[PDB]
Design an enzyme around this catalytic site. Structure first.
Site, PDB file in Angstrom:
ATOM      1  N   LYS A   1       5.436  18.075 -45.403  1.00 33.51           N
ATOM      2  CA  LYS A   1       4.291  17.425 -44.635  1.00 33.51           C
ATOM      3  C   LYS A   1       3.100  18.541 -44.525  1.00 33.51           C
TER       4      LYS A   1
ATOM      5  N   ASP B   1       5.491  16.246 -27.095  1.00 39.17           N
ATOM      6  CA  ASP B   1       5.063  15.187 -28.093  1.00 39.17           C
ATOM      7  C   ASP B   1       5.801  15.015 -29.109  1.00 39.17           C
ATOM      8  OD1 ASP B   1       1.469  14.595 -27.667  1.00 39.17           O
ATOM      9  OD2 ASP B   1       2.823  15.679 -25.985  1.00 39.17           O
TER      10      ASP B   1
END
Ligand SMILES: CC(C)CCN1c2nc(Nc3cc(F)c(O)c(F)c3)ncc2N(C)C(=O)[C@H]1C
Ligand SMILES: CC(C)CCN1c2nc(Nc3cc(F)c(O)c(F)c3)ncc2N(C)C(=O)[C@H]1C
Lengths: 297, 297
Positions: B104, B232
């Site tokens: 990522k 989150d």
């Protein structure tokens, strides 16, 4: 724990690994002669035990030297091993642990001269199909370890990697007197010179064919050198006495010549040109060099 | 011919080769958490076909990530192979050719946050003996290719490297509504969310033991995350339908849980935490996350 040496081994290793991934064509392009690759390494609080913390490694014309190695019948993987499997030993030059290669420190002047003659040198090696007595140049690098910067060149060893040498000469065939040092004489193998030869009656017992080939080779090599305005080179001569420490591999010990059948002792000779990079004149120096070697052989 | 990718593979390769020469102790030192290694490469008129001409590669805390890989039962040589034997495939993340790892792109903000939590994260992995549902961080790098600079992190894939997944959920358990995209729905495997679950009656058929273990794990992981002021994050949920495309290796597909015997269909579930690096509050977010996962399992 000679950091410059470990940068060199690290460098040679990295270089051959990179090249292994490159597709190799039969030809070099003009740009290949102007090419290089630089690698800068910074280790912060890491890997202190092996590598220095900040070092540089520059390889000149990697494609040209790749091409040369193969033309001199050296395989890249073997070359890597010889320089990396274990440290090179000093003595001012280094020699690979397996005694196959010589690693000499040179000046930036020398590097510039090498760059200047590299195309013509390469073309010469093509024409003679790699059959020459010239230095075989296998790689050229720049090393930086925190402040200090050195240039090195790698060549094939003139001497045998197996068979030991009990006597060395360094012949230039000069008019000015040349004789070896008393301080050097004390060392296991001294470095004798033109008059240690011309004085102490040294003979090289090779047959009329081996001599004819050699001198023909020497002639072309030396003319090439003069034509490049190069001088101050020597013939390195090494004598292996079979009846002290003698069958060699002429594909690894490429400079070997067996003695003829009537030779007083069982001898092998190792002879080639060394020290070509210095740029009374070049023209006659070669003739004066060729006169001498004719007389002593 | 994605240059950034090839710098990454080149970089990972170089990194694991260097580490192979380092002696690995059982412990990390505080400095290991502040460490890096930079390599700058300049190729002039050389090697144009593979590598870019000017690139950089920086690895953060190589010793820490070395230690983590081994603690997650990943061998350095296998890791190297997975990232280098063939290119990673895109889709925004990349996955290793063998589907074992996720690559990522992250921000410099994320890199700073990683550095901020790395010691505590490492210590956490020690305490739970590497048995966790947290992201497994395997490496963190900076890439530069002529002007462009990207940061990447490498993790273990939550999904199986063999067994395909026909349904994915991304659950946060939030009060604000979450539902998947119609544009994404068109893609082979959409990314469903909290209400695609809570609405279309999705069940996860695992036995009372597997559920007890999982939730106990989830509890500790999530408390750790909250205590670091992280929020989150999501639970990534993947369903493999045995009766479409189902015995897995729990030592490679570490996040797998087999369905219980009375399950309507033969299913395998892949569940772990993802996306932890963003730094209404953290404290309750975790409780609200834990409430939700309890209800759906
Ligand atoms: C020190 C000077 C005079 C020689 C340096 N030299 C070479 N040396 C050797 N081997 C060598 C081996 C020895 F055991 C030894 O004692 C010795 F003297 C030389 N091979 C090839 C070269 N080539 C091609 C050269 O251009 C230059 C670099
Ligand atoms: C795209 C977002 C939502 C997921 C990204 N993500 C991960 N993704 C995967 N595998 C994965 C595989 C898929 F086939 C797939 O469609 C998918 F969505 C995710 N494993 C671990 C992580 N870990 C730990 C993470 O922190 C982050 C980086």
């Amino acid at each position: 724990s000679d950091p410059l040496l470990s940068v060199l081994m690290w460098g040679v290793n990295h270089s051959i690994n990179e090249l292994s991934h490159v597709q190799i064509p039969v030809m070099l392009m003009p740009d290949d002669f102007k090419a290089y690759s630089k690698i800068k390494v910074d280790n912060h609080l890491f890997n202190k035990e092996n590598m220095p913390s900040h070092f540089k490694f520059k390889e000149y014309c990697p494609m040209v030297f790749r091409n040369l190695r193969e033309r001199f019948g050296i395989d890249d993987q073997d070359f890597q091993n010889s320089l990396t499997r274990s440290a090179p030993l000093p003595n001012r030059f280094h020699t690979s642990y397996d005694k196959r290669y010589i690693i000499k420190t040179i000046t930036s002047e020398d590097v510039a001269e090498m760059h200047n003659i590299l195309k013509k040198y390469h073309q010469y090696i093509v024409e003679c199909h790699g059959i020459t007595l010239l230095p075989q140049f296998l790689g050229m690098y720049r090393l930086n370890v925190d402040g200090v910067e050195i240039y090195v060149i790698v060549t094939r060893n003139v001497f045998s990697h197996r068979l030991s040498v009990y006597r060395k000469y360094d012949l230039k065939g000069s008019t000015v007197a040349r004789e070896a040092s008393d301080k050097e004489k004390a060392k296991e193998l001294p470095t004798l010179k033109d008059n240690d030869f011309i004085n102490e009656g040294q003979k090289i017992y090779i047959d009329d064919n081996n001599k004819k080939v050699f001198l023909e080779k020497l002639k072309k090599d030396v003319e090439f050198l003069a034509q490049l305005k190069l001088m101050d080179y020597s013939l390195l001569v090494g004598i292996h006495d079979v009846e002290r420490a003698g069958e060699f591999d002429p594909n690894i010990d490429v400079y070997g010549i067996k003695c003829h059948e009537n030779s007083p002792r069982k001898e092998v000779y190792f002879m080639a040109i060394i020290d070509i990079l210095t740029h009374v004149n070049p023209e006659q120096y070669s003739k004066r060099f060729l006169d001498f070697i004719g007389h002593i052989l």
